[PDB]
Amino acid sequence: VRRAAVKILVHSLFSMLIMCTILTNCVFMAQHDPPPWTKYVEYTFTAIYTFESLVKILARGFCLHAFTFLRDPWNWLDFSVIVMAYTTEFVDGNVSALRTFRVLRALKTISVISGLKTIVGALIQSVKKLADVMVLTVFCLSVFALIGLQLFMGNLRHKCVRNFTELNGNGSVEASLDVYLNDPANYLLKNGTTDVLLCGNSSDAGTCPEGYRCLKAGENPDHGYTSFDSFAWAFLALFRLMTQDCWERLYQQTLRSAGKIYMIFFMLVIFLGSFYLVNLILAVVAMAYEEQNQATECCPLWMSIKQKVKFVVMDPFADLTITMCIVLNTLFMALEHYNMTAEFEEMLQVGNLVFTGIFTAEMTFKIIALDPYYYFQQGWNIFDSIIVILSLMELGSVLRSFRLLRVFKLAKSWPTLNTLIKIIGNSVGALGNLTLVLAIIVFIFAVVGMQLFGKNYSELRHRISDSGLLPRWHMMDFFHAFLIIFRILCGEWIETMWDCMEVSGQSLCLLVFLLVMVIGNLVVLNLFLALLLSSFGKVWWRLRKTCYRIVEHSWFETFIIFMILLSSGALAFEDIYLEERKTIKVLLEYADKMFTYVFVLEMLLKWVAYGFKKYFTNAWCWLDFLIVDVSLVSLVANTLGFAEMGIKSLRTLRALRPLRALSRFEGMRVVVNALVGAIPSIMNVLLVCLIFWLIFSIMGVNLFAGKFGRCINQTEGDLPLNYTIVNNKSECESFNVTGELYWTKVKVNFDNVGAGYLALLQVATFKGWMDIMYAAVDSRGYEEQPQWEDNLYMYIYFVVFIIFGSFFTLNLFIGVIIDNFNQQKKKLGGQDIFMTEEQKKYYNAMKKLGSKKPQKPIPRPLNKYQGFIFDIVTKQAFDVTIMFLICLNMVTMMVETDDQSPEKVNILAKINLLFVAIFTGECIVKMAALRHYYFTNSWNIFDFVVVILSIVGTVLSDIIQKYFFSPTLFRVIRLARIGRILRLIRGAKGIRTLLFALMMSLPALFNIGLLLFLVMFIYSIFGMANFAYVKWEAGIDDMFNFQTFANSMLCLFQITTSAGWDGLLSPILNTGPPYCDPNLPNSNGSRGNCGSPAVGILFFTTYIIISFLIVVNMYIAIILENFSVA
């Protein structure tokens, strides 16, 4: 039997039955509300498992042998789940927690598979390599959280109410804090949205109207999970701004409490926190992964007829024509839209039949004329014939979905689309089994939530979904829980974590959402990166001499730089309040006139200097000429008529003025040279994404076109009734007796391949799919009003799309950028781009500053008692003792909140005095270390300066007490304390390498972000002239706008992080009533509170693509310096 035990164990069929058993148990777990019948079934499963529990142990047939077998980690899962089932069969008390653990039986899928255990053993390796990075990011987030703790102590909590605190209640009258927190029906709701509008003391925060007073005292943050006080909450908020998830909303709320200035903080953070930390995580994961992969019916009749048709075969000569016919098929299907003319659609079906007959006849002749057995052989022609069969099925909704599948043969004449095909192959091939891990992991968490939250999801529903109904993302089902796990895999958690916490409870909801975020994102990361790696007279001459001496000299250069900077500032003063001061209005008029004159002058000078050949040889000189010609047209239209009708068309192009800056600056021009190097590598990938999105957009047209339109009667703004009030756009007309009802399509939808491309961008950017998916699935019929969830499985479209549309397209994109950039490092005269000659020098000097072989250790004082001082000092003990002292200081610095209690205030002040006393003592002992500690190590000058500064703090506090009290400066006075903790960089060597690498790569990053600043400038003035007077919508508030240049710069800043651009686009794209009405009374001549959809999409899409290219360049600079460190 023991012999029989083994000879059944190694038997393969036994393990395959095990695997199928596991999967069936899985499907029988996934159910919610399990019928009681099914209940008996689970008994059986236990038996099955337990029976092997026999075989496994019985293959050992011995005590020590069976314990050696259990000694394996994977079989521990079997032992545990089987004994759990046994004890549950024995006795129940049962709080239903025991019903959840049955999910881990899924992990047995890992150790039954020959590679799953291998892959998951591979994963834990990269996370252990991620050790130093994890330490740096937690310390960095703690530092920034202390910054934000002292900066925004309860600062978020400010709200606007009606006026209170009137007179002699003594405080209990409104018409103390009790009724004030009871007030929220008094809170000033952010118009058109569900939000209490913040405010602040500063003359920058969100300002309330008449009838409202602004006071910090508020009930709570948005749901208590945002706030910056209570350092744990600040750690959460800075976690999200490290992940940038919904970071725009916290950005808005902060800058509507505190004031716009503090945005510096955010960009600092978003330059350090999100950007840099995430990029390092990327770098280390990729490095460890590449390492791991490196470690790895008559005779003459038959003859004559075969040879006649062979003579036919002698000239196919239709392949390019057939390819054009395929492209014409795709086009013919593409000229499809919402309201198609009758005879139009008749012709379209006509051509449908045309193309079908064409390809069907072609295949019918080819398969018979070349070889039936060969067309049995080559699978390519086989799949062509498959699509033939599918066309036949259509001819003799979804019936169209296959007609597209031919475009892919282009991949043989088009190599990079073959590369996309190889990529999606590796998504199932080389690393494809890795993807199974993802599956399983999703499958685990996909259910681990519902049984923990779904029941709760099912009952406090009024807490999580305001519109009384199921929420848009619940977990009660298993589809919806797959969608939550998916969205979280898409880096968008906290906006559903607030839900999960507001239903059930903080502890477990955290433990599961942080778990899914970290775990699943690490897996998605390893997959992403595995893909990226598997993708691998004489007076004439005299005057000319004067001219060279003029223009080549530093004085003219610096003067022209001063001119161009003043012209850029001129542009910057094109705000909407020019009318507010008349003087500046003619001031800038004369300014512009001087600019035109000096620039045409220097144009002439360059002309005679180089002559037209060397002049128009330069592209930058070409650009300068184009701009100056625009200015010439402008000035002549000013002087000699011909204006005010239609160069008011060429009027705004003046905003491109700063485009002259790139030529003369040493840092912009070089990275711009780099980007023109990326156009030959981005055009092809743009075209690949163009085709590979045209497919999906056609598909969404077939399934979707027209169905999106629903919107509303002008009463509310939210989609109409499915019960109904209206089902039909031809049934709302019977109610349009009053125009209050509007049947409008959603601002971005599938009515073309154009708006299809737009909705596909908004989806695969993840910022603004909400209305897309919602009004996509909810829709049922071609013009049937969307029933609240019907056709619900159409999420499967986006999901499928999203995978490609993000994890391959973007993937492939990044791919070609690397090699190109990689190849750019080869033939370039240098090894790393983005560094000027002087910047190369500076980087080499900064690196030589990284000397690890030290100098002479220390001069002994020879003073006996100073010898004892030395004997206690230069040892490692005193250092780590001081280190624990500074860490206890750290925790002293974490505990504080706002308005804690006066006793706590005094206690913490006294503890600060205690610690600074400690540090003065250490400072005097250090200045007397031997003699020279004040200059032997910069790590000691740091301690000296922080001691003196700490002393300055206490004295400053005393001065504030005795002579005067300031308001926010007081806060800075109490602020520099964080510097103390920074010594850890002295202790920490890993962080001392990482932030050092950041310093190393700060030059190239300065250049790239400088170009970024210039582009923000161009676009911000571009909008200030173009995007003015737009209506307020959800993304475009009162403060983040385009009215001035500051607000424009703040908006375009957030959009520099590809965030919010949905919410800023939606107020632009809109056209016509109700929201947009007779254009506007504008102080400017340009009328309209409305946006221009053409140029709106142009502006925002182009900013996204450009800024995204600059940002990828930033990322690659970071990573290349990272590798050059090691």
Ligand SMILES: *[C@@H]1O[C@H](CO)[C@@H](O[C@@H]2O[C@H](CO)[C@@H](O[C@@H]3O[C@H](CO)[C@@H](O)[C@H](O)[C@@H]3O)[C@H](O)[C@H]2NC(C)=O)[C@H](O)[C@H]1NC(C)=O
């Ligand atoms: C911006 O900060 C100012 C502080 O200058 C806030 O005004 C002050 O608000 C407090 C209440 O929160 C007032 O205190 C009250 O006055 C009596 C006077 O005897 C005081 O004894 C009590 O403590 C009582 O709470 C304080 O008088 C008031 N200052 C003035 C001159 O009205 C202001 O509310 C802040 N703005 C916002 C947006 O809340």
Ligand SMILES: *[C@@H]1O[C@H](CO)[C@@H](O[C@@H]2O[C@H](CO)[C@@H](O)[C@H](O)[C@H]2NC(C)=O)[C@H](O)[C@H]1NC(C)=O
């Ligand atoms: C348009 O909406 C109307 C009202 O919802 C529907 O028109 C029909 O509704 C009546 C009432 O039940 C039925 O008797 C007819 O049979 C319906 N028409 C058809 C063609 O079945 C219907 O929902 C929509 N009809 C059209 C043509 O769009």
Ligand SMILES: *[C@@H]1O[C@H](CO)[C@@H](O[C@@H]2O[C@H](CO)[C@@H](O)[C@H](O)[C@H]2NC(C)=O)[C@H](O)[C@H]1NC(C)=O
């Ligand atoms: C019902 O009909 C009225 C009259 O057309 C609609 O009101 C106008 O809708 C158009 C749509 O572009 C706008 O251009 C006009 O500005 C609207 N007029 C107003 C009120 O100023 C109304 O929208 C229609 N409602 C339905 C049934 O969709």
Ligand SMILES: *[C@@H]1O[C@H](CO)[C@@H](O)[C@H](O)[C@H]1NC(C)=O
């Ligand atoms: C909010 O909207 C109302 C609607 O008329 C408007 O009057 C008010 O100025 C707006 N205020 C803010 C802060 O958006």
Ligand SMILES: *[C@H]1O[C@H](CO)[C@@H](O)[C@H](O)[C@H]1NC(C)=O
């Ligand atoms: C509210 O009323 C008080 C007292 O009249 C006034 O000082 C304050 O400016 C008002 N604020 C509002 C309603 O904007």
